Amino acid sequence: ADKELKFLVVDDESTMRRIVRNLLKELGFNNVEEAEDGVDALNKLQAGGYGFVISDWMMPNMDGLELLKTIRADGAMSALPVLMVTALAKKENIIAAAQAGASGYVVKPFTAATLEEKLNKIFEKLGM
Ligand code: BEF
Numbered sequence: 710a711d712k713e714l715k716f717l718v719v720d721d722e723s724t725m726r727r728i729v730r731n732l733l734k735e736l737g738f739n740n741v742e743e744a745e746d747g748v749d750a751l752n753k754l755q756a757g758g759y760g761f762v763i764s765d766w767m768m769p770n771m772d773g774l775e776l777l778k779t780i781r782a783d784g785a786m787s788a789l790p791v792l793m794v795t796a797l798a799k800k801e802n803i804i805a806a807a808q809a810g811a812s813g814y815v816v817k818p819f820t821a822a823t824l825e826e827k828l829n830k831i832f833e834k835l836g837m
């Protein structure tokens with residue numbers, strides 16, 4: 710994918726945002742911004758330019774499922790890639806996110822290889 714693709718990395722824990730940003734950097738993606746919850750995320754998204762969202766689920770203010778649903782329903786960003794990265798591992802969590810339009814889903818804790826694999830699966834699905 711285009712190494713200038715702009716990522717938004719959303720999680721309420723700075724440690725996990727830092728993991729994901731550093732992993733993206735290794736993969737060659739440096740156009741990366743962070744958000745602390747779904748509301749913060751939507752403010753950045755409204756500012757424009759983003760081409761990929763990686764998001765946690767459990768967050769205050771607006772959780773990641775609500776964030777995914779909002780993005781998918783919004784005519785300006787309905788096809789935005791959204792990779793869910795969450796500790797939630799139950800099949801019913803995975804179903805809810807998948808049905809809501811998740812582009813992919815990674816369970817925490819995850820390896821560097823898993824993130825790269827699941828990112829590439831999305832790129833290839835979307836022809837990026
Ligand atoms: F808080 Be996340 F869903 F890991």
Ligand SMILES: [Mn+2]
Binds near residue numbers: 722766
């Ligand atoms: Mn969280």
